[PDB]
Amino acid sequence: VECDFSPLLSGTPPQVYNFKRLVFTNCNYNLTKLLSLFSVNDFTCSQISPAAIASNCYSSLILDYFSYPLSMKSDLSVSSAGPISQFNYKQSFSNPTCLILATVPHNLTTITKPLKYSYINKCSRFLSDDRTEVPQLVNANQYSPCVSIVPSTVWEDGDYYRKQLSPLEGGGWLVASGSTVAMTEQLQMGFGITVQYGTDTNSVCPKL
Ligand SMILES: *[C@@H]1O[C@H](CO)[C@@H](O)[C@H](O)[C@H]1NC(C)=O
Numbered sequence: 365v366e367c368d369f370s371p372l373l374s375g376t377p378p379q380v381y382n383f384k385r386l387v388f389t390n391c392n393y394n395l396t397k398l399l400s401l402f403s404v405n406d407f408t409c410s411q412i413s414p415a416a417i418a419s420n421c422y423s424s425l426i427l428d429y430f431s432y433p434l435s436m437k438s439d440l441s442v443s444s445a446g447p448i449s450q451f452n453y454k455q456s457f458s459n460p461t462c463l464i465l466a467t468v469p470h471n472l473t474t475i476t477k478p479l480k481y482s483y484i485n486k487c488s489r490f491l492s493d494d495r496t497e498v499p500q501l502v503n504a505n506q507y508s509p510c511v512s513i514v515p516s517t518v519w520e521d522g523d524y525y526r527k528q529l530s531p532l533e534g535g536g537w538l539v540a541s542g543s544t545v546a547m548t549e550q551l552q553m554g555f556g557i558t559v560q561y562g563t564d565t566n567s568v569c570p571k572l
């Protein structure tokens with residue numbers, strides 16, 4: 365009857381384009397209890413507040429978490445053309461959402477570091493003319509089209525990934541490039557929260 369955030373605290377977190385997603389229904393949560401394990405560097409919301417998201421009742425609550433460098437903050441903003449919002453991670457524009465940037469302290473030994481930070485810097489599609497390039501932007505609540513060809517961790521910065529599509533998928537080529545950022549002194553993470561408001565189904569409530 366309590367929301368289990370355990371898989372977030374055990375093992376190596378994934379990369380922004382392989383964000384691990386936890387779904388929560390019919391349970392109770394202590395959100396300030398979870399954030400206290402971390403040094404919270406950034407906390408921004410949309411159509412909700414950081415105070416409201418901790419003290420409200422939802423039909424459902426979605427939690428996305430990945431490894432993400434604090435340096436790359438502006439790339440998460442939909443205002444920017446940054447490769448993260450375009451090709452890696454996008455939260456729903458319809459529902460209330462929250463994005464949290466935090467650092468995992470040395471005490472939290474159960475969370476292990478990746479070798480580095482990885483992200484997709486370009487993901488596009490070449491039309492049959494083989495001259496025109498159509499960017500393949502990531503949709504809300506979905507992974508990127510290029511996740512199938514981009515590895516869990518990019519081996520070297522500037523690596524290219526291509527795939528010849530079948531007429532089923534439309535023909536043409538699928539192109540992706542990878543980029544790396546050097547691992548920080550302390551692992552930095554990104555947490556994306558999405559909540560749904562129902563009518564008679566608001567089962568997810570704060571632990572009191
Ligand atoms: C545990 O965290 C505290 C900060 O709350 C820190 O001062 C301490 O060094 C950590 N424990 C160890 C064994 O480093």
Ligand SMILES: *[C@@H]1O[C@H](CO)[C@@H](O)[C@H](O)[C@H]1NC(C)=O
Pocket residue numbers: 394395396397570571572
């Ligand atoms: C559980 O949530 C309450 C708010 O409802 C918070 O004040 C408290 O600190 C949380 N529990 C712990 C052990 O921190």
